Amino acid sequence: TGYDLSASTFSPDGRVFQVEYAMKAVENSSTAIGIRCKDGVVFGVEKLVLSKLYEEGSNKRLFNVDRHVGMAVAGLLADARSLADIAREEASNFRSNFGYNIPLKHLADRVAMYVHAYTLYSAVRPFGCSFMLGSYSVNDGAQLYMIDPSGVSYGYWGCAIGKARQAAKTEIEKLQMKEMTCRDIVKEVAKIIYIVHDEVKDKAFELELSWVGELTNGRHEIVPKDIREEAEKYAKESLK
Amino acid sequence: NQYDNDVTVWSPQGRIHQIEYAMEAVKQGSATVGLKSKTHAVLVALKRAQSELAAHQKKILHVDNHIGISIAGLTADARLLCNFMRQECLDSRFVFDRPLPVSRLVSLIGSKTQIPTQRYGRRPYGVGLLIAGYDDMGPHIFQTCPSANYFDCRAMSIGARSQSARTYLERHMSEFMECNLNELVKHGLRALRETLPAEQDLTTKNVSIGIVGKDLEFTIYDDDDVSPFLEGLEERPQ
Amino acid sequence: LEGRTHIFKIHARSMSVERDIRFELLARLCPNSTGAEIRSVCTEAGMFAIRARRKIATEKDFLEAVNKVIKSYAKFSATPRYMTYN
Amino acid sequence: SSAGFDRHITIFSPEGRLYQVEYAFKAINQGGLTSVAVRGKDCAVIVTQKKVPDKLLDSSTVTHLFKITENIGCVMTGMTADSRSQVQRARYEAANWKYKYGYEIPVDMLCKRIADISQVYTQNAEMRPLGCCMILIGIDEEQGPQVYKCDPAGYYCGFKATAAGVKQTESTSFLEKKVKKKFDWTFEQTVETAITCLSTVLSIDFKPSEIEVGVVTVENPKFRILTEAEIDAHLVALAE
Amino acid sequence: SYDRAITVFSPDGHLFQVEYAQEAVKKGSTAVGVRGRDIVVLGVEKKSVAKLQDERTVRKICALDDNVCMAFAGLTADARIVINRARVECQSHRLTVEDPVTVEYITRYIASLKQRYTQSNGRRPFGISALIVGFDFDGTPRLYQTDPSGTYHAWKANAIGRGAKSVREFLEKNYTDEAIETDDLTIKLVIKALLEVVQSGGKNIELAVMRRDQSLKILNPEEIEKYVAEIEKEKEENE
Amino acid sequence: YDRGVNTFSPEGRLFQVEYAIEAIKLGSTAIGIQTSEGVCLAVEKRITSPLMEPSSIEKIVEIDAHIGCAMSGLIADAKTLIDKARVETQNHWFTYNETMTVESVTQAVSNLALQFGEEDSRPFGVALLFGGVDEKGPQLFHMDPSGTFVQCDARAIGSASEGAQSSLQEVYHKSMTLKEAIKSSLIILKQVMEEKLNATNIELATVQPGQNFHMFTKEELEEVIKDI
Amino acid sequence: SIMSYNGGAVMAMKGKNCVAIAADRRFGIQAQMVTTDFQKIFPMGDRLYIGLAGLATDVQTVAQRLKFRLNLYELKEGRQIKPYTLMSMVANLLYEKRFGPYYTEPVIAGLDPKTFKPFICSLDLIGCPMVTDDFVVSGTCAEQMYGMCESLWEPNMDPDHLFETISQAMLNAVDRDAVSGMGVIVHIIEKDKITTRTLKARMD
Amino acid sequence: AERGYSFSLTTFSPSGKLVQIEYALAAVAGGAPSVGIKAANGVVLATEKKQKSILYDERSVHKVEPITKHIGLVYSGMGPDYRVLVHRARKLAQQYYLVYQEPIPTAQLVQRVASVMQEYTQSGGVRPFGVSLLICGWNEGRPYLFQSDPSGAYFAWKATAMGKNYVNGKTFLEKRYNEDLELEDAIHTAILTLKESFEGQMTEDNIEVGICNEAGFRRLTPTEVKDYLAAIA
Amino acid sequence: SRRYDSRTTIFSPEGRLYQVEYAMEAIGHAGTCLGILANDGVLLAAERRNIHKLLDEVFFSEKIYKLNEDMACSVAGITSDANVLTNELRLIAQRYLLQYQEPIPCEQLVTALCDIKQAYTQFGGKRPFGVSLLYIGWDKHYGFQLYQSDPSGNYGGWKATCIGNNSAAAVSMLKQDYKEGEMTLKSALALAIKVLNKTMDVSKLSAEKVEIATLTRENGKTVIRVLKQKEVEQLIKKHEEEEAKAEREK
Numbered sequence A: 001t002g003y004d005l006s007a008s009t010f011s012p013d014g015r016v017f018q019v020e021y022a023m024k025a026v027e028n029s030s031t032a033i034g035i036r037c038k039d040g041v042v043f044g045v046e047k048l049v050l051s052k053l054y055e056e057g058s059n060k061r062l063f064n065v066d067r068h069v070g071m072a073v074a075g076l077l078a079d080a081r082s083l084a085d086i087a088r089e090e091a092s093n094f095r096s097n098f099g100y101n102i103p104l105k106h107l108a109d110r111v112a113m114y115v116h117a118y119t120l121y122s123a124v125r126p127f128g129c130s131f132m133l134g135s136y137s138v139n140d141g142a143q144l145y146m147i148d149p150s151g152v153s154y155g156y157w158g159c160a161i162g163k164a165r166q167a168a169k170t171e172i173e174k175l176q177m178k179e180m181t182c183r184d185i186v187k188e189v190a191k192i193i194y195i196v197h198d199e200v201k202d203k204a205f206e207l208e209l210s211w212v213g214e215l216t217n218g219r220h221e222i223v224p225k226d227i228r229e230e231a232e233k234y235a236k237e238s239l240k
Numbered sequence B: 001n002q003y004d005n006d007v008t009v010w011s012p013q014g015r016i017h018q019i020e021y022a023m024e025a026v027k028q029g030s031a032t033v034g035l036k037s038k039t040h041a042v043l044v045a046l047k048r049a050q051s052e053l054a055a056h057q058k059k060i061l062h063v064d065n066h067i068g069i070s071i072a073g074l075t076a077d078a079r080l081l082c083n084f085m086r087q088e089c090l091d092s093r094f095v096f097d098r099p100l101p102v103s104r105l106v107s108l109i110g111s112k113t114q115i116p117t118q119r120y121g122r123r124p125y126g127v128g129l130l131i132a133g134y135d136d137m138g139p140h141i142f143q144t145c146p147s148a149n150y151f152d153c154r155a156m157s158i159g160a161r162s163q164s165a166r167t168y169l170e171r172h173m174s175e176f177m178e179c180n181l182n183e184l185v186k187h188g189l190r191a192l193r194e195t196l197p198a199e200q201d202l203t204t205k206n207v208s209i210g211i212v213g214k215d216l217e218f219t220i221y222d223d224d225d226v227s228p229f230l231e232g233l234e235e236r237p238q
Numbered sequence C: 001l002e003g004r005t006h007i008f009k010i011h012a013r014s015m016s017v018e019r020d021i022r023f024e025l026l027a028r029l030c031p032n033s034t035g036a037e038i039r040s041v042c043t044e045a046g047m048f049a050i051r052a053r054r055k056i057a058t059e060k061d062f063l064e065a066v067n068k069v070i071k072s073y074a075k076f077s078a079t080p081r082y083m084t085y086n
Numbered sequence D: 001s002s003a004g005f006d007r008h009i010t011i012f013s014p015e016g017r018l019y020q021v022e023y024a025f026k027a028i029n030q031g032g033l034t035s036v037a038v039r040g041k042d043c044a045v046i047v048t049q050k051k052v053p054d055k056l057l058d059s060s061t062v063t064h065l066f067k068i069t070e071n072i073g074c075v076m077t078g079m080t081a082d083s084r085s086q087v088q089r090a091r092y093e094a095a096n097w098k099y100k101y102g103y104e105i106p107v108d109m110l111c112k113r114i115a116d117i118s119q120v121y122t123q124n125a126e127m128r129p130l131g132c133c134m135i136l137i138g139i140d141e142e143q144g145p146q147v148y149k150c151d152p153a154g155y156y157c158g159f160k161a162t163a164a165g166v167k168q169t170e171s172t173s174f175l176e177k178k179v180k181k182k183f184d185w186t187f188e189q190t191v192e193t194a195i196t197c198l199s200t201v202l203s204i205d206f207k208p209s210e211i212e213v214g215v216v217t218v219e220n221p222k223f224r225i226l227t228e229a230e231i232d233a234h235l236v237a238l239a240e
Numbered sequence E: 001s002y003d004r005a006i007t008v009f010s011p012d013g014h015l016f017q018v019e020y021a022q023e024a025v026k027k028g029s030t031a032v033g034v035r036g037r038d039i040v041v042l043g044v045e046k047k048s049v050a051k052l053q054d055e056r057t058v059r060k061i062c063a064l065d066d067n068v069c070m071a072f073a074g075l076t077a078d079a080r081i082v083i084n085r086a087r088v089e090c091q092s093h094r095l096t097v098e099d100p101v102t103v104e105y106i107t108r109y110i111a112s113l114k115q116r117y118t119q120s121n122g123r124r125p126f127g128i129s130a131l132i133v134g135f136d137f138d139g140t141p142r143l144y145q146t147d148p149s150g151t152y153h154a155w156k157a158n159a160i161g162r163g164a165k166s167v168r169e170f171l172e173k174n175y176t177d178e179a180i181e182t183d184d185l186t187i188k189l190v191i192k193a194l195l196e197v198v199q200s201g202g203k204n205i206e207l208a209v210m211r212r213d214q215s216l217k218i219l220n221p222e223e224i225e226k227y228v229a230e231i232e233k234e235k236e237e238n239e
Numbered sequence F: 001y002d003r004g005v006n007t008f009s010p011e012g013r014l015f016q017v018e019y020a021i022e023a024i025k026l027g028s029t030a031i032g033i034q035t036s037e038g039v040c041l042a043v044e045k046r047i048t049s050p051l052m053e054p055s056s057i058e059k060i061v062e063i064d065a066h067i068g069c070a071m072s073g074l075i076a077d078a079k080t081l082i083d084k085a086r087v088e089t090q091n092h093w094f095t096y097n098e099t100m101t102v103e104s105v106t107q108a109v110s111n112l113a114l115q116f117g118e119e120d121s122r123p124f125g126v127a128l129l130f131g132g133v134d135e136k137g138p139q140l141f142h143m144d145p146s147g148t149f150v151q152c153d154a155r156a157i158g159s160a161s162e163g164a165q166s167s168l169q170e171v172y173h174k175s176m177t178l179k180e181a182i183k184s185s186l187i188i189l190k191q192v193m194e195e196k197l198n199a200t201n202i203e204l205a206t207v208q209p210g211q212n213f214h215m216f217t218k219e220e221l222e223e224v225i226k227d228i
Numbered sequence G: 001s002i003m004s005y006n007g008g009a010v011m012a013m014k015g016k017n018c019v020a021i022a023a024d025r026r027f028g029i030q031a032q033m034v035t036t037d038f039q040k041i042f043p044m045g046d047r048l049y050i051g052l053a054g055l056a057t058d059v060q061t062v063a064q065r066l067k068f069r070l071n072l073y074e075l076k077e078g079r080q081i082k083p084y085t086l087m088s089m090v091a092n093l094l095y096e097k098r099f100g101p102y103y104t105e106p107v108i109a110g111l112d113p114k115t116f117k118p119f120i121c122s123l124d125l126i127g128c129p130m131v132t133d134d135f136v137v138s139g140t141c142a143e144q145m146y147g148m149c150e151s152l153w154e155p156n157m158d159p160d161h162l163f164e165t166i167s168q169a170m171l172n173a174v175d176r177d178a179v180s181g182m183g184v185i186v187h188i189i190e191k192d193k194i195t196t197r198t199l200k201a202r203m204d
Numbered sequence H: 001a002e003r004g005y006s007f008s009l010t011t012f013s014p015s016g017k018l019v020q021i022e023y024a025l026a027a028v029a030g031g032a033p034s035v036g037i038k039a040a041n042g043v044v045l046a047t048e049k050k051q052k053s054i055l056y057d058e059r060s061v062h063k064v065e066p067i068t069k070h071i072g073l074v075y076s077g078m079g080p081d082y083r084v085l086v087h088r089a090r091k092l093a094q095q096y097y098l099v100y101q102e103p104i105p106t107a108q109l110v111q112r113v114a115s116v117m118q119e120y121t122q123s124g125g126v127r128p129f130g131v132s133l134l135i136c137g138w139n140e141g142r143p144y145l146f147q148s149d150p151s152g153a154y155f156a157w158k159a160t161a162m163g164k165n166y167v168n169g170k171t172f173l174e175k176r177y178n179e180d181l182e183l184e185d186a187i188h189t190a191i192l193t194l195k196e197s198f199e200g201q202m203t204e205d206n207i208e209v210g211i212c213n214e215a216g217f218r219r220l221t222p223t224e225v226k227d228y229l230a231a232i233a
Numbered sequence I: 001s002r003r004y005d006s007r008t009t010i011f012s013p014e015g016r017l018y019q020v021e022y023a024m025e026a027i028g029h030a031g032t033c034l035g036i037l038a039n040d041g042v043l044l045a046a047e048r049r050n051i052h053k054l055l056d057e058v059f060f061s062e063k064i065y066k067l068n069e070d071m072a073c074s075v076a077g078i079t080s081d082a083n084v085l086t087n088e089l090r091l092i093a094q095r096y097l098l099q100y101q102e103p104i105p106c107e108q109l110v111t112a113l114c115d116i117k118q119a120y121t122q123f124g125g126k127r128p129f130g131v132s133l134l135y136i137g138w139d140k141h142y143g144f145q146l147y148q149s150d151p152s153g154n155y156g157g158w159k160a161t162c163i164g165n166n167s168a169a170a171v172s173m174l175k176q177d178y179k180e181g182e183m184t185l186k187s188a189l190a191l192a193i194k195v196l197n198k199t200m201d202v203s204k205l206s207a208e209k210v211e212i213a214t215l216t217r218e219n220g221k222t223v224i225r226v227l228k229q230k231e232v233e234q235l236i237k238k239h240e241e242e243e244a245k246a247e248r249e250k
């Protein structure tokens, strides 16, 4: 009774419900996972189709914050765009006062501090966004971090977000993160995404992909679907 | 029922009712249907008034030369954001000596409405803006919501019972990209004509249309300026 | 607003209504009074008329006590049922 | 006995008690960890562990041993989101000590300054008390090694051997008998006891890869994290 | 700073602390006053003095300048501030535009400042009102009144405090052209207005008249006792 | 369920604004008329007792030289807007050497329509009737406490405004002369007032491009009284 | 100059068991006399004084600020102010403005509130604390002050010889410069009583 | 500015009593016992610090934190709120020592500190301290002993006590401690009355004895602490 | 965050000030102080709250504070609560003496503090001051003056006083003992001791439980007489001799 109101207020169970409600808030969003190969980092986003709804390529959850880093977000899109501006401005501070590529670690840390700070005051609310962070470089290598609305900064070789999560990362153990090059990881991910997320709930959908690594020379960009057209080729034949 | 008090509080279901209650204000506004083709874009709005003697309140208003917009709901925050909207126009028009592509322009709007959707004591903004504009790749149509989500579309509609208009859209909006400005206009208002009751107009003064193009600057059409657009149309059947 | 007078039409059968009394004028002076308070309006008309021995209540006679009977009873409490559930 | 908003804010109960800090006390149990702090004559050992639910976990990113100073490490308990926020402020205050006073911080005063800020979190009712638990070590000139702890009551603490948290109540009473008697403490003595107190509480006896063992000794005073290879040497040394 | 909404609009359209503030004025001291062509007169009562305490400390009537005099009702604590406020504004109207101060200008300052004093955050409305009396330039009379909402308004006669309806009822026989056709009669007219006011014991009643530009003189309970004597003598000759 | 006084309704909209519209019902009624010759506007002073001084309360004050205005509900509530708007139009005249249009006053007040809040306090519930003569001739405008502007030919406010618009549109037409509109106002006024008609009960606010200002003067209304 | 504008000389000297302080009564702008009744030394507390030399504005201002904090000190703590605490109070007050300092030559001559023990000190215009065990001299011309007092003042002096000594010193020093004169006032204080005398000096 | 709410959380009860401050008095009673004695030459304070487990070392944390070289102090109640006003008073005496260049009077510390503390009770949105200070020192040859409270009032006692059973101890200090005795006796009856409510174990680490000589405050080492009381009292 | 404030500032719908009513109830308890009309002097007395003989009594005047050389005050309420106000008004007085170099008269002094107290009442939700303290002093114009401070922001200055609610019987006693222009301050002193000899619950009238601070007008020193209990005891026994003589009638 009223304990869940302010995030700064504790509960008789010794936690904060505002974080808790914020977590499943991101779970109701469409599935968005991530995985990293050895020479790069793969991103993926699944865009639902309700009515039409509008033009293809709109309000994609794949955002590019930095030269070598990008944002694959889930949950409420607005807060994700605002936090993408926050990471943009922080990265700009690093490039201003140092002049080289911001390491993934301290990047996601600087963001994580904000995620935690907006949960220590009754004025603002915990964020309803959970996003994937990954990058590759020659003096750095392949790192992937997972950030949650509570403000925990950590990372795995792969992670899953959205309504399909446990079932989305179940087949990840079958995939080889090391031996499999990124070129193959693309199709390996897209085929399961086409098989997961059953079409009874959502009749139509659309899938976005992004990648950064050595093949793009550290430049992070959405992989062009007219190029190689990898997904539908193998994903439409992978249903059997 | 007490957890809907603040904008900061997260519902046990994770749905903040303040934004939904603003969406109801969007539904209480007039039905306006915007649409664009591969070349020119046409936006249509509906004028309403309280008494017969009162002049119908206009919706579409001119901001940038190539950027017109519609409106619905609260006019207070609407004109506030409209001052902001003018600011952003003349800004790049001064510094860069060039206008701003709407794509990057509305991001600024969503970030503007992000703060009052989070900090305590602040309220969201009820908004019915439908923005149209031409960068080098042609027209763009977006949508505005108190949640601060803008969606790129070829056509969208808000207001009272504006979904029924969409039902006419889906089949028509795919084939309306090739057509020129002329028929595009009346195809715009054909969606509104099914939103209003079918036993009455749909006059010239209760409706607002504007046309904007890559080579055609945006001009507000109202009253007698709508007379060329309404003429030569077929009435709705029974 | 236009419906407030209907309560006055039902209560008009009681006592005696002078032909010059306007109900629509009195009705606007008491918004949000439902029917109970205006029942007490018609009531205090003849109530204060008995004390003044008047057989019929003249429109100007009771209204002087009607602005008082709405305000004086709103002074301690305005009866905010809208606030009870809000 | 409770009256008014005292459950939701930070004040005194009708009996003088505070509800928020007692909730934060059990806030550590939601992390499900254990930390044991043992100090010898010339040495001090810190032992902890980690949970690896998925094979995608990186040992490096999820390591719970934080290093504030080259010569002074630390560890935390409970949720990590709250601990991280305290990490950067620990380090910041270390650097400002080094800037203002020109010499390394005793670490004795570090927990005190930190605990003052923790008082502010305890005082203001419109901000979260930050219930993470701070555990530090240190090295003083001719004072031997030192072991400190800090709890979110806004106070400082530091003893010979102290262990606080979920299961630490039982590890304490186990340590009290091992310290004395008359038993002296050397390097291998402390290292070999770190696992005994963990086994008595747990008795899982698992792969050394999950547990992390920190140590601080005056040979090279620089703090050092132990490799799994040598940890396994001590683990087979204690089991004959 | 201090940000809080003190007064809000209720769904009935009436504010709360504003209209409720009028009850404090009904529960305050009673004060009266009149206007005339030459000598304007005020009044005050319900002092509740124990006759063992000095009257200047309980004094309810002050003046900004010799031309414009101040009279308030209700609780004095909130009036102190309004006084000093109006003193600064009267001294500014003196500073710039050196002409004497007009009641219409100064009371409008009190009302405006009290209005925003009911609007901004961290501001609790006053529960008191007041009425100002003087004599306009060129021998004209001047008076105005204040309101919790800050609505200035000029009366022909002052009826406020406990039993304002009762005194105002007596003013109906006061507005006759005969009263007051003479200053000598105006004074006794205040005593006759206070006779139906409060206890009308002839002790707490205090009044000062201002004739044209001449400053007012507070009268001791010497002439007021003779005026009471002639009041009971007028009721004697009326039988 | 009193939420920050700035928070939307479940239906919904702004609570305090919705409630502030009801305060117009308890205020005095005023009926303006727009004519091709001019703009005439009248109000009922609603005199409670003979203690009231006739010229003390004036519901109509002219904001700009050629632009008038009429308030609604509470008086001092509009005071703050009144005196500040006149300054607005004045400064317009200073920068551009030209007077402000009747339409300009609208957005002038709309920008300050709702400034209330806590950080960074109560919205005024006084409605405004804007009279004046712009470059297009005599114009009459109406605005509401929520800030929604609408151009009204003949608009009424206060209590009976619902009943007043009623008999209004019945007798209203676009061929109304100014002298006809004048005596058409008082017909409705005398039906909605309890006190007998006198020069102290109501006042007429008229303005014309060729007759000004005007404003209005005394004894002119006294001739209109006998015109009934 | 700045200090030669108004001028003035303040001289304080300690006797055997007592202490004396004296200052000239001339007040004028440059070479123009104004008034001779102007008061420079002001009484502070009991059995204690303060001398001031410089612009008369800073004299009065510093005197009033000093009385300000003084009373606040003696109202909180019933004990009288100590001589060391007084000198430190003045030092702080003058140091408050580093780049906007007042132009004055403070001279502090007063008895210890504890015992008959006297004390003397003078501070720099920027508030530099300075103490002496013989005398303190601040004014227009320091040559005749330091010149005469070393050949006159003795370690042990009764009030008779103290008065006459500081007398002829102020006479010979003041009569040399034209920006001082118009009589000199002498304040000699002891444990038993306070004595104030006015010297006979040239009025030209 | 936080947001700057700053609304006082302590209302006045119908009887005039304070809510949060009386509850803080409950926190003072629930604290630890600490006695003090003002007799003859100087003031002697006796605190009590007991470890909840045998793993604890009291050579690190000190309960007696002298603010000045000639001004010591102890406390009762919760420690966290004690450290706060410690650092406070440390910065607070320095303006006095900087302006006047003179050791600040014990009675001056109280007024300044309790004024900021009382404001800390009236300041909106924050709870008062739950610590009752016992302030001592020697100034002008006559030492002094003061006692503070969460509401901020200040008293002067020859021998006082705080903590549990302080009302029972107070009657002991009244009869058993009177007139004026040397610092040695001051230590004696202090330790006797502290051993009243203390456990059946008394070690150098169980308590500490602070002393204010007219030569200035000196904090005694646990060595002498166990030397006088061994053989307690 | 709006729900956490108790709304101490806003009124009570009954017409009363909610916080201020409870505020006055604090003055009803605790402190007790008196005042009386005296010629060529003024007198004040208070009842010590801690009558325990273990105190050091090194504070000299406790419940009687001296804000100025010509004026003093008698506090009733929480000590430190006043101690903010005493240094406050003390600085205001001292800045009058700084600006004009003239002793501040009692009028504007008191009213300045009263407006300070009023400020805390109309905004901020702050804790008002529940300390009602008295005022004495002498000015050139009006001479000896008696005033009293109220939490409500009004100054309660009269020629007599009731502090606290226990003294409301002293007011009824003062209406029977009312006098004009009679001093003999010792008569008013035996009167004020006659007040606590009856109205006060503590009997025997212990000279160590009360403190009498008189201020006699002296030019220009304005002598402030702080008396010791030794000469008060013989005065008390002189009063008890007057009591023993009054029972000799019947």
Ligand SMILES: Nc1ncnc2c1ncn2[C@@H]1O[C@H](COP(=O)(O)OP(=O)(O)OP(=O)(O)O)[C@@H](O)[C@H]1O
Residues within 6 Å of the ligand: C007, C034, C035, C036, C039
């Ligand atoms: N609009 C109306 N029409 C007719 N009668 C009315 C109206 N409003 C009120 N009344 C009369 O007023 C009387 C008092 O109403 P009453 O107090 O019974 O409502 P209620 O039962 O208390 O409402 P609720 O059950 O919601 O509390 C009723 O007997 C009813 O006849």
